[PDB]
């Protein structure tokens, strides 16, 4: 992807992506608006299992689109299973999408409501051996999405907030060990699930989306720090990393299932 030029600006944003990635207008694109009244309870959905006790974080990277907290996924240490999933999915990284204002920022919406941000915990199906092979499969990834609203601070998020100063610009990375992703989860694991895609180019249709109903609360100071990051690289004109979210896409021939 050394020649990719997509972004979130007026000239390379979501409405332009289809030119280089035609799948942008595909049959199972994400995100989507979750109409809570139309989603149907599916009593066959097995309980969701989030096993992050042995998670091993390694580094945090500003990739020019968001920042990723990466994990060691060379072993089954932090896995997601159950719910609508068949098999074991290993945590590889998490990142967020956020806005320039508290009134926008999330990718998925709930009855058209936009949250201040959205956390994506990305996992890949171990039956495919590695992440690169998994994204070529319809059931290759499972992304656990969690909404963020502004209110009380999330103590478990502070370690991330404080390290952002070291990765202000595109390409910067910093050691980020011993971070516990369990501190970013809400109390309830009630969720909505549907078949979708990566929300950024290449927009591959390889994701089983599991979006939690309960948002976590973060403080204004915490999200404000996210907005101080840069899309640009060091020594380049400063462009604040804000509004790095793709808007809701057509649901088309899909049904959103609720676990509750």
Ligand X SMILES: NS(=O)(=O)c1ccc(C(=O)N2CCC(O)(c3ccccc3)CC2)cc1
For residue 246, the tally of other CB atoms under 10 A from its CB is 22
Candidates 65, 120, 172, 213: give the one binding Zn ion (CB under 5 A).
Answer: 120
Nearer to Zn ion, 114 or 120 (CB): 120
In DSSP terms, 14 is beta-bridged to: none
**Binding mask 13-42 vs Zn ion (x if CB under 5 A, - otherwise)?**
------------------------------
Strand 40-41 relative to strand 257-258, pairing = parallel
Least separation in angstroms between CB 95 and Zn ion = 6
CB proximity list for 58: less than 8 A, separation 6 or greater: 70, 71, 72, 175, 176, 177
Q: Say how many residues touch Zn ion, by CB under 5 A.
A: 1
Min dist CB 89 to ligand X, Å, is 13
In 3D, which of 133, 119, 59, 60 has the Cα closest to residue 90? 133
Alpha helices, DSSP H only, in 53-128?
none
The distance from CA 182 to its chain's CA centroid, rounded to whole angstroms, is: 15
Residue 199 annotated as part of some ligand binding site: yes
Q: Which of 4, 11, 65, 108 is catalytic?
A: 65
Does 126 show up as a binding residue in the annotation?
no
Which residues of this chain interact with ligand X, rule CB under 6 A? 120, 122, 132, 135, 143, 198-200, 202
**28/120 with CB nearer ligand X:** 120
Is it true that the peptide bond before 31 is cis, omega within 30 degrees of 0?
yes
Closest-by-Cβ residue to Zn ion is: 120
* Rounded Cα distance, 219 and 176, in Å: 22
Rounded distance, CA 116 to CA 103, Å? Answer: 6
Catalytic annotation on 11?
Answer: no
Minimal distance, residue 16 CB to ligand X, in Å: 17
- CB 90, min distance to ligand X, A: 14
Active-site amino acid positions? 65
Give the residue ranges of the annotated binding site. Answer: 95, 97, 120, 199-200
Give the residue ranges of the annotated binding site for Zn(2+). Answer: 95, 97, 120
């Amino acid at each position: 992807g050394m020649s990719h030029h997509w972004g979130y600006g007026k000239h390379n944003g979501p409405e332009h992506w289809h030119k280089d990635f035609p799948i942008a207008k595909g049959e199972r694109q994400s995100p989507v608006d979750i109409d809570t009244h139309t989603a149907k309870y599916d009593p066959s959905l097995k309980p969701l299992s989030v096993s992050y006790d042995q998670a091993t974080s390694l580094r945090i990277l500003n990739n020019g689109h968001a920042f990723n907290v990466e994990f060691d996924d060379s072993q089954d240490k932090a896995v997601l299973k159950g719910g609508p999933l068949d098999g074991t999915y290993r945590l590889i990284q998490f990142h967020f999408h956020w806005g320039s204002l508290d009134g926008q920022g999330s990718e998925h919406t709930v009855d058209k409501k936009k949250y201040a941000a959205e956390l994506h915990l990305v996992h890949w199906n171990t039956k495919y051996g590695d992440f690169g092979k998994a994204v070529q499969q319809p059931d290759g990834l499972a992304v656990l999405g969690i909404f963020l609203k502004v209110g009380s601070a999330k103590p478990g998020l502070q370690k991330v907030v404080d390290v952002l100063d070291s990765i202000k610009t595109k390409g910067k990375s910093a050691d980020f060990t011993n971070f516990d992703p369990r501190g970013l989860l809400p109390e309830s694991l009630d969720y909505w699930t549907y078949p979708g895609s990566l929300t950024t180019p290449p927009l591959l249709e390889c994701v089983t989306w599991i979006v939690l109903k309960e948002p976590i609360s973060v403080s204004s100071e915490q999200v404000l720090k996210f907005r101080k990051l840069n899309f640009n690289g060091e020594g380049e004109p400063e462009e604040l990393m804000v509004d790095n979210w793709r808007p809701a896409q057509p649901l088309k021939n899909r049904q959103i299932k609720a676990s509750f």
